[PDB]
Design a binder for this molecule. Structure first.
Ligand code: YBM
Ligand code: MG
Length: 231
């Protein structure tokens, strides 16, 4: 398979794990921080299934890039867990197969982007400008937590055009089956999830629940309790 370079087309993407509308687990099935329980409906995807899926995504990425140098771009803050697990598994897969004449596989890079207040996009993407000129003529793999509206990645890929990057491919942990979706597709996708606001595995509601290990549905009491005053 060739290195993807049609950002938003997901030209050759394998189907993600399909999480059905009624899939999930009650809150007593797994360890949940006691104070979060009253603000969650259910566990949608446990921590362990997320980790197992990311290991397979790392395998899929290694199969595409083989030994070709690429540059992994973490979209902070929500991608932290996903990015961490991808780095772990890509490094292990690459370094386990390496010989003394091998080379490192990837560089690691960070951009902070922000657009949500409560459970809704403001429709403006804030980007913390660190000079990405070092990615000129490089293969770039964007690592993102979730595609929902598709506004973050459409706007971020437009921003990247100025740096004359060789290829842009997208790895995304979750894609949401929402009528808000603008059609933006990733090249590597973990899970297709139902239209509910998820929290956990670094995904927040107004900075709450990033530490929750499982992908869970926040209930209306949680949305009310932690509703933003500002922005
Ligand atoms: N926690 C959480 N849960 C969801 O279901 C979410 N859906 C969208 C978000 C917010 N951050 C996303 C990128 O990190 C925005 C993706 P977009 O709507 O721009 O495609 C989000 N955050
Ligand atoms: Mg967020």
């Amino acid at each position: 398979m060739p290195i993807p370079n049609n950002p938003g087309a997901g030209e050759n993407a394998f189907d993600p794990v399909f999480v059905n509308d009624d899939d999930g687990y009650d809150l007593d099935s797994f360890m949940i921080p006691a104070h979060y329980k009253k603000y969650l409906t259910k566990v949608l995807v446990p921590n362990g299934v997320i980790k197992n899926r990311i290991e397979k995504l790392a395998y899929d990425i290694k199969k595409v890039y083989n030994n070709e140098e690429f540059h992994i771009l973490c979209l902070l803050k929500g991608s932290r867990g996903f990015f961490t697990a991808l780095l772990k598994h890509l490094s292990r897969i690459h370094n386990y197969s390496a010989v003394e004449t091998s080379k490192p596989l990837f560089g690691e890079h960070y951009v902070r982007v922000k657009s949500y207040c409560n459970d809704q996009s403001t429709g403006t993407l804030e980007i913390v400008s660190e000079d990405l000129s070092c990615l000129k003529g490089k293969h770039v793999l964007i690592v993102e937590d979730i595609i929902d509206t598709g506004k973050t990645l459409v706007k971020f890929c437009e921003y990247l055009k100025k740096f004359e990057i060789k290829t842009v491919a997208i790895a995304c942990l979750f894609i949401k089956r929402t009528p808000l979706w603008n059609g933006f597709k990733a090249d590597f996708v973990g899970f297709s999830i139902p239209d509910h606001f998820v929290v956990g595995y670094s995904l927040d509601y107004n900075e709450i629940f990033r530490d929750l290990d499982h992908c869970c549905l926040v209930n209306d009491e949680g949305k009310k309790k932690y509703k933003a005053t500002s922005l």
